[PDB]
Amino acid sequence: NAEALQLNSTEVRILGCLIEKQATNPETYPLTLNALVIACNQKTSRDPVMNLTQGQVGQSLRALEGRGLTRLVMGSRADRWEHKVDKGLELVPAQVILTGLLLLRGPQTVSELLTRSNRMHDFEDSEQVVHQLERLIARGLATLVPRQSGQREDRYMHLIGDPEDLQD
């Protein structure tokens, strides 16, 4: 019934940032366009580092809005934007955080996800993270990435972007 989103690298970055900043500084959220491009081009908490301009962010924001995944919040001071990933993909906040982490940075291990979600959602332990990821997988929104020699820890990745990024 429900097909794949195949969001581009910009749309992926945007949603990540909306989720991140909603959790990490609510006082700044919904994000203005400029706050959003700053969040997109950040050196830290980003893989990879981007350099998207205002117009790229603006059109991906309108493109997303059309898909029901962003919502324009108009106001007297300036337009601010919010994500609609929870309502849109029917996800509990824990799943929205994890998805956010995976969008921002790609394939991550459970312990990385636990550490990075620390000031965003409070997973009491790595069992709760797995609980939630298993559901994302059952949903068709994340995936366990097969490991091989180099690392002896599972990695997880989201299924919301270009599926050819996951293809060798």
Structural domains of the chain ordered from first start: 1-90 (1.10.10.10), 91-168 (1.10.10.10)
Within 8 A by CB and 6+ apart from 49, the residues are: 41, 42, 43
Half-sphere exposure of 132 (CA within 13 A, CB side): 23
Residues 119 and 26 sit within 8 Å (Cβ to Cβ): no
- The span from the CA of 141 to the CA of 70, in Å, is 18
For 145, phi then psi, to 5°, come to: -90, 130
Cα–Cα separations (whole angstroms), residue 149 to 106, 153, 156: 19, 10, 16
Question: How was it solved?
Answer: X-ray
Report the distance separating Cα 152 and Cα 163, nearest Å: 25
Residue with tokens 């400029």: 34
What are the DSSP E strand ranges found in the chain?
Answer: 31-32, 70-73, 80-83, 142-145, 155-158
Q: Measured between alpha carbons, how far is 22 from 101 in angstroms, rounded to an integer?
A: 13
| Spatial contact of 33 and 57, defined as CB atoms under 8 Å apart | yes
What is the experimental resolution, given in Å to one decimal place? 2.2
List the one residue out of 92, 12, 83 whose CA is nearest residue 52.
Answer: 12
Q: Treating both helix axes as pointing N-terminal to C-terminal, what angle do 9-24 and 93-105 enclose, rounded to 10 degrees?
A: 130
Amino acid at 158: H
* Calpha distance 19→167 (Å, rounded): 26
Helix (H, G, I), strand (E, B) or coil at 45: coil
Q: CA Rg, the chain, in Å? A: 16
State both tokens at 58.
């603006």
